[PDB]
């Protein structure tokens, strides 16, 4: 399409009553004194002019052309004027009773007409007085002023609006105003009208770039809400709002600044409002800040971690307020390498009557790596020394038989040996010069038992055992639970390499064998089996790069304590362009895995109880050179019901583009009926083209609009 557009655009060459004159001028007659007839043609760096009559001054390069037509050179625009003028040494092209369009010759899809139009080539703007905007022969719109940006320079003013119809809000309209504040910062203020609520949400975006990094803030505010005021009539007001801030950057190569902050007025906000940052898929808003110092051998980070939880099912949420992380590294300590991890944290709760704590943790590590061409062995030793002081215990110790203690010390030696080999083989069976690789690992891990049931669990979730997960030293993500270990992980990877030494394929299989029960003393775990030792955990992984366009991935986890495949996923993708792809994917997580790893009520509530068995298909394809079709479909195979469906069509031309998007998604549950709720949305976007550097076919933007968005699996 960009070639089909530039095919309709003129391209620029590197004297003389009289005709060909040199900017270049041609005519049937010229009178020279200034110059004044018939077949007047004028051409230069940026324009062609044509008409019956013309005039110019040869000292100033000033010019007039009557009743003429014009085209831009190396840029897409054209039009006509009753008098066309050049002024200010070719900065200004000025049009009395003039017109403009970016459409190719004869294909008049849209135009602007005005009593005057000024093109300014230094400011990259067309300015219009008494502007009328036309689609075909019909004037759609009028204003006393208009300005079109006819280049790539950023400018303040209204953007092209967009609309949608949603089952949630009925008709919706967005009118963005953009503010060009500075080279390194800008804002957008967007009134969002919603017909069902009968009031405008004011959406405010601010963006910045600084020595400390780059970031974005959003403040969305709705002064009152006629829908929410009927569902929640008890409150002071129906104010709905969102505040968001993201920041990231590294300053002077050593100071690291991050913000990841969302806050909303109420639990219901993202189920009501489709938004640029949150989702109806999310059960909480995250609120994080961190400041780090980092250098080659050392780093220290201070952070806070707060979460706003939407569900009523439990109102307790823990925060880190603050957390401090410290790392120090020292290599070549004789034959050894050394590292120290330290942490200090205070845990705070949203409830006034939950336990609170201070924790300190210190973790010196010493290790000995030994390595050959064909294999390596690595030995680590650590102390896991931890101290708690715990507070506000009266309430919890009144409800529970196992009691929290005001002061706790936990000290544990960890010992690990991790050993790997590599074998190679020449292939004749596939193709000449192909090579196979085979890579067995074995790891032994020992951690002794400590009873941790006097420590409340503030920060430790049970981790998921994928094929890389088989070789972790931890069962839990935090420091409030550290299970005993006495186990050998074994696993093997095989790879196939082509004659150019590129990896075409790999497959990995492995298991954890437990010599003793892996315990914390607060285990309480609702497995299907009483199995505690032996080859309990299995995981496997594969990747095939079938060609430069075809790729296949798969993963499986089997746990003997569930008597079932715990989780599995696979995907096959064909991708040729950004605009041409097909992906199939499947995701599985068993009912037994939900029961084991998630809140106790998930096993009893029908919307969680059955696990996951999800088929997904995603496609993008160009139809002719000018249509993009995008689509996605997701299906719960245990429900026999749709999870998500999306369908996007863009028609793309040299003069304009139009996109229609459809989404139908899961958006809650009806407690009065025990069925899912769905939201439908139809969105309409329209865009002028040929005025700026954008000829994109819109596919990758549509592919990430839905609740289960596309990821490229090649």
């Amino acid at each position: 399409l960009a070639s089909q557009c530039m095919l309709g655009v003129p391209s620029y060459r590197p004297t003389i009553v009289f005709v060909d004159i040199m900017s270049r001028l041609q005519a049937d007659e010229v009178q020279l004194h200034t110059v004044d007839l018939g077949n007047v043609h004028y051409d230069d760096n940026q324009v062609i002019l044509k008409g019956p009559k013309g005039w110019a001054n040869l000292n100033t390069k000033d010019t007039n052309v009557w009743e003429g037509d014009y085209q831009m050179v190396g840029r897409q625009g054209r039009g006509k004027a009753d008098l066309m003028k050049q002024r200010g040494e070719n900065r200004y092209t000025i049009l009395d009773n003039g017109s403009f369009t970016s459409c190719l010759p004869g294909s008049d899809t849209w135009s602007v007409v005005g009593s005057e139009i000024i093109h300014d080539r230094e400011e990259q703007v067309a300015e219009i007085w008494n502007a009328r905007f036309k689609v075909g022969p019909v004037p759609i719109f009028y204003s006393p002023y208009l300005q079109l940006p006819v280049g790539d320079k950023r400018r303040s003013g209204f953007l092209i609006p967009n609309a949608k119809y949603t089952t949630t809000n009925y008709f919706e309209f967005y009118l963005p105003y953009y503010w060009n504040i500075a080279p390194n910062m800008d804002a957008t203020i967007t009134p969002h009208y919603m017909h069902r609520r009968g009031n405008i949400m004011w959406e405010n975006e601010f963006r910045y770039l600084s020595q400390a990094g780059a970031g974005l803030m959003e403040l969305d505010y709705l002064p009152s809400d006629k829908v929410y005021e009927d569902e929640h009539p008890n409150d002071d007001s129906s104010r709905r709002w969102l505040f968001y801030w993201n920041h990231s950057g590294v300053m002077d190569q050593v100071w690291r600044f991050n913000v990841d902050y969302t806050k909303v007025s109420d639990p219901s906000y993202f189920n009501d409002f489709d938004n640029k940052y949150g989702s109806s898929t999310d059960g909480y808003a995250t609120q994080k800040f961190s400041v780090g110092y980092a250098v080659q051998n050392f780093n220290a980070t201070v952070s806070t971690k707060q979460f706003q939880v939407f569900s009523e099912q439990n109102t307790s949420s823990y925060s880190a307020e603050p957390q401090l992380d410290v790392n120090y590294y020292q290599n070549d300590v004789g034959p050894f390498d050394t590292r120290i991890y330290g942490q200090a944290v205070h845990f705070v709760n949203t409830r006034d009557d939950m336990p609170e704590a201070t924790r300190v943790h210190l973790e010196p590590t010493i290790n000995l790596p030994l390595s050959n061409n064909w294999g390596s062995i690595n030995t680590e030793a650590k102390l896991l020394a931890t101290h708690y002081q715990q507070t506000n215990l009266d309430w919890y110790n009144s409800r529970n038989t196992t009691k929290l203690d005001e002061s706790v010390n936990r000290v544990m030696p960890q010992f690990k040996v991790d050993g790997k080999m590599v074998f190679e083989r020449d292939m004749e069976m596939l193709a000449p010069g192909y090579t196979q690789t085979l890579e067995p690992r074995a790891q032994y891990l020992y951690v002794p038992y400590r009873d941790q049931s006097d420590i409340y669990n503030y920060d430790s979730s049970l981790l998921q055992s994928d094929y890389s997960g088989l070789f972790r030293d931890r069962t839990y993500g935090g420091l409030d639970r550290i299970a005993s270990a006495n186990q050998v992980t074994t696993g093997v990877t095989s790879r196939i390499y082509d004659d150019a030494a590129v990896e075409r394929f790999n497959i990995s299989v492995g298991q954890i064998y437990y010599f003793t029960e892996s315990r914390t003393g607060d285990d309480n775990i609702t497995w299907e089996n009483d199995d505690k030792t032996g080859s309990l955990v299995w995981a496997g992984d594969t990747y095939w790069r079938i060609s430069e366009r075809w790729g296949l991935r798969g993963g499986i986890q089997y746990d003997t304590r569930l008597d079932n495949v715990a989780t599995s996923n696979s995907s096959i993708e064909y991708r040729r362009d950004e605009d041409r792809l097909v992906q199939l994917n499947y995701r599985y997580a068993s009912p037994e895995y939900i029961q084991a790893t998630l809140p106790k009520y998930y096993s009893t509530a029908e919307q969680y109880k059955n696990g996951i068995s999800q088929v997904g298909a995603v496609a993008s394809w160009p139809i002719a050179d000018r249509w993009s079709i995008v689509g996605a479909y997701y299906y719960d195979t245990n429900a026999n019901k749709q999870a998500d469906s999306m369908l996007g069509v863009q028609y793309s031309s040299c003069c304009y583009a139009i996109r229609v998007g459809y989404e139908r998604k899961l958006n809650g549950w009806d407690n009065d009926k025990q069925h899912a709720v769905y939201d439908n949305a139809i969105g309409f976007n329209i865009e002028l083209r040929g005025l700026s550097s954008n000829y994109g076919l819109g596919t990758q933007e549509m592919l990430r609009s839905n609740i289960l968005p596309y990821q490229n699996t090649l």
Partner: peptide
């Protein structure tokens, strides 16, 4: 009408 684009250092 306005025009949005990338941020850059002055």
């Amino acid at each position: 009408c306005g025009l949005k684009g990338p941020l850059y250092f002055p």
